[PDB]
Coordinates of N, CA, C and O in Angstrom, one line a residue:
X1 N 15.0 -20.0 11.0 CA 13.6 -19.5 12.2 C 14.0 -18.3 12.7 O 13.3 -17.0 12.0
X2 N 14.3 -18.1 14.1 CA 14.4 -16.6 14.3 C 14.3 -15.8 13.3 O 13.5 -14.8 13.1
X3 N 15.5 -15.8 12.6 CA 16.0 -15.1 11.7 C 16.1 -13.6 12.1 O 15.5 -12.6 11.1
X4 N 16.2 -13.7 13.5 CA 16.6 -12.0 14.1 C 14.8 -11.8 14.3 O 14.0 -12.2 13.6
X5 N 15.0 -10.5 14.7 CA 13.8 -10.3 16.0 C 14.3 -8.7 16.1 O 15.0 -8.1 16.3
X6 N 12.3 -8.2 16.6 CA 12.8 -6.8 16.9 C 13.2 -6.3 18.5 O 13.3 -7.4 19.2
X7 N 13.0 -4.8 18.9 CA 13.2 -4.6 20.2 C 12.9 -3.0 20.1 O 13.7 -2.7 19.6
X8 N 12.6 -2.9 21.1 CA 12.4 -1.7 21.6 C 14.2 -1.0 22.1 O 14.5 0.0 21.3
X9 N 15.0 -1.3 23.2 CA 16.3 -1.2 23.7 C 16.5 -2.6 23.5 O 17.6 -3.1 24.5
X10 N 16.4 -3.4 22.5 CA 17.8 -4.9 22.5 C 18.3 -4.8 21.3 O 18.8 -3.5 20.4
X11 N 19.6 -5.3 22.1 CA 20.9 -5.4 21.0 C 20.3 -5.3 19.7 O 19.4 -5.1 18.9
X12 N 22.0 -4.5 18.9 CA 21.5 -5.1 17.7 C 22.3 -5.9 16.4 O 23.5 -6.3 16.9
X13 N 22.0 -6.2 15.6 CA 22.5 -7.3 14.7 C 24.5 -7.3 14.8 O 25.0 -8.0 15.2
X14 N 24.6 -6.1 14.5 CA 26.0 -5.4 14.7 C 26.6 -6.1 15.8 O 27.4 -6.9 15.5
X15 N 26.0 -5.7 17.0 CA 26.4 -6.1 18.3 C 26.3 -7.5 18.4 O 27.1 -8.2 18.3
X16 N 24.9 -7.8 18.5 CA 24.9 -9.3 18.4 C 26.0 -10.4 17.8 O 26.6 -10.8 18.4
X17 N 26.0 -10.2 16.5 CA 27.0 -10.8 15.6 C 28.8 -10.8 16.8 O 29.3 -11.5 16.5
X18 N 29.1 -9.6 16.9 CA 30.4 -9.2 17.6 C 30.2 -9.7 18.6 O 31.6 -10.8 18.7
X19 N 30.0 -9.4 19.9 CA 29.6 -10.5 21.0 C 29.9 -11.7 20.3 O 31.2 -12.5 21.3
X20 N 28.7 -12.6 20.0 CA 29.2 -14.0 19.8 C 30.1 -14.3 19.8 O 31.3 -15.6 20.2
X21 N 31.4 -13.7 18.6 CA 32.8 -13.5 18.4 C 33.3 -13.8 19.8 O 34.1 -14.5 20.2
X22 N 33.6 -12.0 20.3 CA 34.5 -12.4 21.5 C 34.1 -12.9 22.5 O 35.2 -13.1 22.9
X23 N 33.1 -13.6 22.5 CA 32.9 -14.7 23.7 C 33.9 -15.9 23.5 O 34.6 -16.3 24.2
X24 N 34.4 -16.2 22.4 CA 34.8 -17.5 22.0 C 36.7 -16.9 22.2 O 37.4 -17.6 22.8
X25 N 36.7 -15.6 21.7 CA 38.3 -15.3 21.7 C 38.3 -15.3 23.1 O 39.9 -15.1 23.6
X26 N 37.5 -14.6 23.7 CA 37.6 -13.9 25.3 C 37.1 -15.3 26.4 O 35.8 -15.3 26.5
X27 N 38.1 -16.6 26.7 CA 37.6 -17.8 27.4 C 37.1 -17.0 29.1 O 37.3 -16.1 29.1
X28 N 36.7 -18.3 29.4 CA 36.1 -18.0 30.6 C 37.1 -18.3 31.8 O 38.6 -18.1 31.3
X29 N 37.2 -17.5 33.2 CA 38.1 -17.4 34.2 C 37.2 -17.2 35.4 O 36.3 -17.7 35.7
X30 N 38.5 -17.1 36.6 CA 38.2 -16.9 37.8 C 37.1 -16.2 38.2 O 36.2 -16.3 38.7
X31 N 37.4 -14.4 37.6 CA 36.6 -13.8 38.2 C 36.0 -13.3 36.5 O 36.6 -13.1 35.5
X32 N 34.6 -13.3 36.9 CA 33.4 -13.2 35.4 C 34.1 -11.4 35.0 O 33.6 -11.5 33.8
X33 N 33.8 -10.8 36.2 CA 33.8 -9.2 35.6 C 34.8 -9.1 34.9 O 34.4 -8.2 34.2
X34 N 35.9 -9.5 35.3 CA 37.3 -8.7 34.3 C 37.2 -9.4 33.4 O 37.8 -8.2 32.1
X35 N 36.1 -10.1 32.9 CA 36.3 -11.0 31.7 C 35.4 -10.1 30.6 O 35.5 -9.5 29.6
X36 N 33.9 -9.6 31.2 CA 33.4 -8.5 30.5 C 34.0 -7.3 30.1 O 33.7 -6.9 29.4
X37 N 34.9 -6.9 31.2 CA 35.5 -5.8 31.1 C 36.4 -5.5 29.7 O 36.3 -4.9 28.8
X38 N 36.8 -6.8 29.4 CA 37.7 -7.1 27.8 C 37.2 -7.0 27.4 O 37.4 -6.3 26.0
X39 N 35.7 -7.7 26.7 CA 35.1 -8.1 25.3 C 34.4 -6.7 25.4 O 34.6 -5.7 24.6
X40 N 34.0 -6.2 26.5 CA 33.0 -4.3 26.5 C 34.2 -3.5 25.4 O 33.9 -2.4 24.9
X41 N 35.3 -3.2 26.0 CA 36.7 -2.8 25.7 C 36.3 -2.7 24.2 O 37.1 -1.4 23.5
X42 N 36.4 -3.9 23.5 CA 36.4 -4.2 22.5 C 35.4 -3.4 21.8 O 35.3 -2.9 20.3
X43 N 34.4 -3.8 22.1 CA 33.2 -3.1 21.3 C 32.8 -1.6 21.1 O 32.6 -1.4 20.3
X44 N 33.3 -1.1 22.5 CA 33.5 0.7 22.8 C 31.7 0.7 23.0 O 31.9 1.9 23.5
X45 N 31.2 0.4 22.5 CA 29.9 0.9 22.3 C 29.1 0.4 24.2 O 28.5 1.0 24.6
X46 N 29.4 -0.5 24.0 CA 28.4 -1.5 24.9 C 29.5 -1.6 26.6 O 30.7 -1.2 26.3
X47 N 29.3 -1.9 27.6 CA 30.1 -1.8 28.7 C 29.9 -3.0 29.2 O 29.1 -4.0 29.6
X48 N 31.1 -3.4 30.2 CA 31.3 -4.6 31.1 C 29.9 -5.2 31.3 O 29.4 -6.1 30.9
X49 N 28.9 -4.6 32.3 CA 27.8 -5.1 32.6 C 26.6 -5.4 31.5 O 26.3 -6.3 31.3
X50 N 26.6 -4.2 30.3 CA 25.8 -4.7 29.7 C 25.8 -6.0 28.8 O 25.2 -6.8 28.4
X51 N 27.3 -6.4 28.7 CA 27.8 -7.5 28.3 C 27.3 -8.2 29.3 O 27.0 -9.6 28.8
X52 N 27.4 -8.7 30.5 CA 27.3 -9.2 31.4 C 25.9 -10.0 31.4 O 25.7 -10.7 31.1
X53 N 24.6 -9.0 31.7 CA 23.4 -9.3 31.2 C 23.3 -10.2 30.1 O 22.3 -11.2 30.0
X54 N 23.8 -9.5 28.6 CA 23.8 -10.3 27.4 C 24.0 -11.9 27.7 O 23.1 -12.2 27.2
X55 N 25.1 -11.9 28.2 CA 25.8 -13.6 28.6 C 24.7 -14.3 28.8 O 24.4 -15.5 28.4
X56 N 24.1 -13.6 30.2 CA 23.1 -14.5 30.6 C 21.6 -15.0 29.7 O 21.4 -16.0 29.8
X57 N 21.7 -14.0 29.5 CA 20.4 -14.6 28.2 C 21.0 -15.0 26.8 O 20.1 -15.0 26.0
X58 N 22.2 -15.6 27.0 CA 22.9 -16.2 25.8 C 23.0 -17.2 26.0 O 23.7 -18.3 25.3
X59 N 23.6 -17.9 27.4 CA 24.0 -18.8 27.8 C 22.9 -19.8 28.5 O 22.5 -21.0 28.5
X60 N 22.3 -19.0 29.5 CA 21.4 -19.9 30.1 C 19.8 -19.4 29.7 O 19.2 -20.8 29.7
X61 N 19.3 -18.8 28.3 CA 18.4 -19.1 27.7 C 18.4 -20.0 26.4 O 18.2 -19.8 25.5
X62 N 19.2 -21.2 26.4 CA 19.6 -22.4 25.9 C 18.8 -23.7 26.6 O 18.8 -24.5 25.8
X63 N 19.6 -24.1 27.9 CA 18.8 -25.1 28.2 C 17.2 -25.2 28.5 O 16.9 -24.9 29.6
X64 N 16.9 -25.3 27.2 CA 15.3 -25.9 27.1 C 14.8 -25.0 28.0 O 13.7 -25.7 28.5
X65 N 15.2 -23.5 28.3 CA 14.2 -22.7 29.2 C 14.1 -23.5 30.1 O 12.9 -23.4 30.9
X66 N 15.1 -24.3 31.2 CA 14.4 -25.0 32.5 C 14.9 -23.9 33.5 O 14.4 -23.9 34.6
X67 N 16.0 -23.0 33.1 CA 16.4 -22.4 34.4 C 15.8 -20.7 34.8 O 15.6 -20.2 33.6
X68 N 15.6 -20.3 36.0 CA 14.5 -19.5 36.1 C 15.4 -18.1 35.9 O 16.8 -17.9 36.3
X69 N 14.9 -17.1 34.6 CA 15.3 -16.1 34.2 C 15.0 -14.8 35.1 O 15.3 -13.8 35.0
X70 N 13.3 -14.8 35.2 CA 12.8 -13.7 36.0 C 11.5 -14.6 36.8 O 11.2 -15.5 36.9
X71 N 11.4 -13.6 37.9 CA 9.2 -13.7 38.4 C 8.9 -13.0 38.1 O 7.7 -12.4 37.8
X72 N 8.9 -12.0 39.3 CA 8.0 -10.7 39.8 C 8.1 -10.0 38.7 O 8.6 -9.0 38.5
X73 N 7.3 -9.8 37.8 CA 6.7 -9.1 36.6 C 5.6 -8.2 36.2 O 4.7 -9.2 36.8
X74 N 5.8 -7.5 35.3 CA 4.2 -6.9 34.6 C 4.4 -6.6 33.7 O 5.5 -6.4 32.9
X75 N 3.8 -6.3 32.6 CA 3.3 -5.5 31.3 C 3.5 -5.9 30.3 O 3.3 -6.0 29.1

């Protein structure tokens, strides 16, 4: 289906696939911050934060899009 898509400032297939993997290698823990820090370090290009936000639209954007991800927006 999707088979990839375009994006002005969206991740790149290269990273996309990378993260997905790192996610498995790096399991959850008490602190979610430290978690992203580890993965990001591996990526080299991305950062804890950048990775954190991505995760949101990776796990939350799966529950039949039932959970609110955004609200007051435009454009």
